[PDB]
Amino acid sequence: TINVNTNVSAMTAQRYLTKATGELNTSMERLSSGNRINSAKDDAAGLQISNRLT
Amino acid sequence: QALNEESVALQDELNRIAETTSFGGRKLLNGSFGEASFQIGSSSGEAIIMGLTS
Task: Confirm if B42 and B29 have CB atoms less than 8 A apart.
Answer: no
Method: cryo-EM
Integer Cα distance of A32 and A16 in angstroms: 24
CA distance A51 to A42: 14
Under a CB-based contact definition with an 8 Å cutoff, are residues B30 and B24 in contact?
no
A51 to chain B, closest Cα gap in Å: 9
> How far is the alpha carbon of B24 from chain A, nearest alpha carbon, in Å?
5
**What one-letter code names the amino acid at A27?**
S
Count the alpha carbons within 13 Å of B46 in the hemisphere toward its beta carbon: 4
Kindly provide the resolution of this structure in angstroms, with one decimal: 3.4
Q: Which of B12, B49, B16 is nearest to B33 (CA)?
A: B49
Asked if B25's CB is within 8 angstroms of A53's CB, the reply is no
H-run or E-run covering B36: strand B34-36
Rg of chain B in Å (alpha carbons): 17
